[PDB]
Amino acid sequence: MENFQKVEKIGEGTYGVVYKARNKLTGEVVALKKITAIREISLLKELNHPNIVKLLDVIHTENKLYLVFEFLHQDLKKFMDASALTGIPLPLIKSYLFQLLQGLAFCHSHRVLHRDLKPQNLLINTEGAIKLADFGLARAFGVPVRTYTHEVVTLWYRAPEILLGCKYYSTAVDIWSLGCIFAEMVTRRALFPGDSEIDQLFRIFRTLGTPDEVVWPGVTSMPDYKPSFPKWARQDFSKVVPPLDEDGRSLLSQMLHYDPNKRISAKAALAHPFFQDVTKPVPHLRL
Numbered sequence: 001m002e003n004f005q006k007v008e009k010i011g012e013g014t015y016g017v018v019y020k021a022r023n024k025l026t027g028e029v030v031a032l033k034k035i036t037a038i039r040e041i042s043l044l045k046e047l048n049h050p051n052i053v054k055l056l057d058v059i060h061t062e063n064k065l066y067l068v069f070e071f072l073h074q075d076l077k078k079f080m081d082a083s084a085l086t087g088i089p090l091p092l093i094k095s096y097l098f099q100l101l102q103g104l105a106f107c108h109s110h111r112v113l114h115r116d117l118k119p120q121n122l123l124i125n126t127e128g129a130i131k132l133a134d135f136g137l138a139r140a141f142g143v144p145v146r147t148y149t150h151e152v153v154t155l156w157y158r159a160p161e162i163l164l165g166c167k168y169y170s171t172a173v174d175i176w177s178l179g180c181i182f183a184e185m186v187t188r189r190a191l192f193p194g195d196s197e198i199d200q201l202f203r204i205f206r207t208l209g210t211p212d213e214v215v216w217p218g219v220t221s222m223p224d225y226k227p228s229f230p231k232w233a234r235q236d237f238s239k240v241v242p243p244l245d246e247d248g249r250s251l252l253s254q255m256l257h258y259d260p261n262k263r264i265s266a267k268a269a270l271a272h273p274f275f276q277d278v279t280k281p282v283p284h285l286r287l
């Protein structure tokens with residue numbers, strides 16, 4: 001750590017504080033996150049891709065763990081809050097979604113899941129790029145109910161299989177989270193802002209219909225499934241994400257399929273017609 005000068009506190013992450021810091025040597029500006037785990041994290045150093053925030057180094061000393069990351073200037077949560085009045089233009093939403101799917105496709109091809117995607121871990125730059133932060137940390141350290149600062153870990157983007165107690169969820173969980181984020185960028189409101197596990201599940205059910213054996217073979221056997229769940233009818237996506245076009249609604253619908261085995265993969269999503277006219281606009285960032 002004596003190699004880094006702290007510039008400012010960025011925030012409190014899931015596992016520890018995150019600081020903007022300067023390498024007293026290279027003068028490089030980085031993000032420093034103050035946190036079997038060592039081996040898992042160490043593997044992440046080679047999982048490099050333009051849409052994945054680079055893990056520069058791991059420092060383990062005095063039994064304390066610091067992760068040194070590539071620094072980006074803003075996160076998607078802040079960008080969305082800042083774009084509230086007018087919304088993020090569709091072409092930028094499309095570019096972001098396309099880039100995030102590329103990041104997922106890459107990680108998923110290596111059998112590495114993120115597991116806790118949310119706007120706070122999607123970082124953006126002035127060039128129009130967006131990158132996934134904290135990839136792989138959930139498997140390395142787990143996902144707590146509350147952060148080290150006691151802040152509640154959001155449930156809003158959690159896939160239904162996780163909520164229903166699946167022990168061995170798949171890469172499909174990240175596709176669900178990203179679909180939730182896609183909807184939120186379009187409508188300027190979180191899709192399923194649950195404030196407890198059952199509220200999160202019931203919010204999903206009220207919009208997508210209570211899952212049954214027809215749409216999700218095996219659902220009724222899942223550990224936390226209860227036959228006493230209320231049976232709500234599915235809503236049309238035209239009501240859920242106006243004014244998204246049919247291509248976007250079609251893709252969203254596939255990213256939010258209940259059955260994880262049938263939910264679209266990141267690779268398949270990249271080929272969806274919605275991306276026919278994708279471009280890479282520059283966001284307006286006031287740093």
Ligand SMILES: Fc1ccccc1-c1cn2ccnc2c(NCc2cccnc2)n1
Nearest residue numbers: 011012013031069071072073074075120133
């Ligand atoms: F530059 C980075 C590299 C790796 C992780 C986060 C950042 C990073 C850099 N940032 C610069 C401005 N805002 C952020 C930001 N916000 C997300 C956030 C909020 C609270 C706690 N943790 C993250 N994260």
